Amino acid sequence: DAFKITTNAKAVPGNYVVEVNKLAQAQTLTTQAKVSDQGAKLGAEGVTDRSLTITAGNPPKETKIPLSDDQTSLVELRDAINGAKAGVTASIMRVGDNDYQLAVSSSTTGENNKISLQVDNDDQLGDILNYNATRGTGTAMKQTVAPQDAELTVNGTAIKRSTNSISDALQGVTIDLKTKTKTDEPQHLVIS
């Protein structure tokens, strides 16, 4: 139940027990500013050198993208971010009528697959999107899902990995994680 197994000729037939303690997660950052209209421009008027720099991936890569005034609505920011292929994906959460938030999620899972966002030349948009090591008030960009590694034990040996597809721990075996195992309840595996 907690995982799928695939094997090749290198797998050793035998008795295995597996515990799954944590699944790898992609960090998510979500806007917190009150936005009643996902098509309304949120940036300052008349800026010709606005950009957004996204740092993401492992190793971290920085992508800088220009944004016209028209691209400062949630919908257009989402489109610009997705089109940039910057190691993140963007989607809009309609929390309720007149209440929209933009969620930026790492394209890759893992503890070290974190995100920073920095707006240049638009402090007003910066107050909505900027995200780095420190956070000062309630309406700034906020982490809503933590970056996390997968953590499992195979025959009692603890393994940590950046993804939920573990192909480089046991030769000939790939363990694709689906859920945690129950707390005092290792799952049994026979390879034959």
How far is it, in rounded angstroms, from Cα 122 to Cα 35?
17
| Residues with Cβ within 8 Å of residue 40, at least 6 apart in sequence | 73
Task: Kindly list the residues in this chain that would bind Cl ion in the complex (CB under 5 A).
Answer: 22-23, 85, 87, 91-92, 107, 146, 171
Name the minimum Å distance from CB 120 to its own copies: 25
Of 125, 146, 144, 137, the closest CA to residue 74 belongs to: 125
Binders of its own copies among 163-192, rule CB under 8 A? 164, 168-171, 178-180, 185, 187-188
Is 73 a residue that touches its own copies (CB under 8 A)? no
189 binds, among Na ion, Cl ion, its own copies, none (CB under 5 to 8 A by kind): none
- Cβ closest to Na ion, residue 39 vs residue 60: 60
- Cβ closest to its own copies, residue 62 vs residue 168: 168
In order of 51, 60, 117, 130, the CA distances from 63 in angstroms are 10, 10, 10, 14
Residue 77 tokens read as 């920011």
| Residues with Cβ within 8 Å of residue 140, at least 6 apart in sequence | 32, 127, 128, 130, 131
Name the minimum Å distance from CB 46 to its own copies: 30
Helix (H, G, I), strand (E, B) or coil at 126: helix
Kindly report the number of other CB atoms within 10 A of residue 170's CB atom: 21
Q: After which residues is the chain broken (C to N over 2.5 A)?
A: none
- Region near Na ion per CB under 5 A, out of 21-29, 72-80, 83-91, 101-109: 83-91
30 binds, among its own copies, Na ion, Cl ion, none (CB under 5 to 8 A by kind): its own copies
41 binds, among its own copies, Cl ion, Na ion, none (CB under 5 to 8 A by kind): none
Q: Which helix (H) or strand (E) holds 158?
A: strand 157-161
**Site residues (CB under 5 A) for Na ion?**
85
Annotated binding residues for Zn(2+), as ranges?
127, 149, 188
Return residues touching its own copies (CB under 8 A).
Answer: 12-17, 23, 25-26, 28, 30, 78, 82, 89-96, 101, 103, 105-107, 109, 143-145, 154-160, 164, 168-171, 178-180, 185, 187-188
